[PDB]
Amino acid sequence: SLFELGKMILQETGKNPAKSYGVYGCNCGVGGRGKPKDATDRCCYVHKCCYKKLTGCDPKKDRYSYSWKDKTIVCGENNSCLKELCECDKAVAICLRENLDTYNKKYRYNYLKPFCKKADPC
């Protein structure tokens, strides 16, 4: 669920997740997908495409189990959808951390999201 997703992003990036990524670019946070602004935005693009493939559980609402072991996100066994979901969320949290070096505040609050250029099919 959003809680786990938000938590993972905090753990990996050290950043307030909603503040840094809630309305970032054309792909991070609220809304759908669009042509990526930068590498951070591309992380979120991939993440939303990941959510699209999921069947059997609800990515926004469904809780899943994971642990913090040797400062690594370790997805619990869960079930097929929940584990795929956990891995979707882990991957984007990792991606966002790896692109903190080009994170740009000028994209942080993009209220022009509805008018982003259309994204390519996943």
Add this chain to the structure above:
Amino acid sequence: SLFELGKMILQETGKNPAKSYGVYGCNCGVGGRGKPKDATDRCCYVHKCCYKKLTGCDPKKDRYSYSWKDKTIVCGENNSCLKELCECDKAVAICLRENLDTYNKKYRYNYLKPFCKKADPC
């Protein structure tokens, strides 16, 4: 849609809407309803109750038209459902404005939202 809602909140409160209300309390922004933390939170509680009356349109994704007349939100044209939706969004924007005097930053990023006490029926 979220865009119109965000814009109304900006117009009434003068605040960055996602920043101030995206994760506030147990009712504002993401997630469902919960026992309200304060008057601001109760504004969002009422808003989400208002949404349940809607039949025919999608509050997160469906666009509607409104205008800014004599510094007032004026819901335009719109079918029966979109009219109601617009009026729901207008009501919460006004309410948030009216309760700026007790807005509390400590509730602003409430990542304990999944653990809010259960909301009473609307």
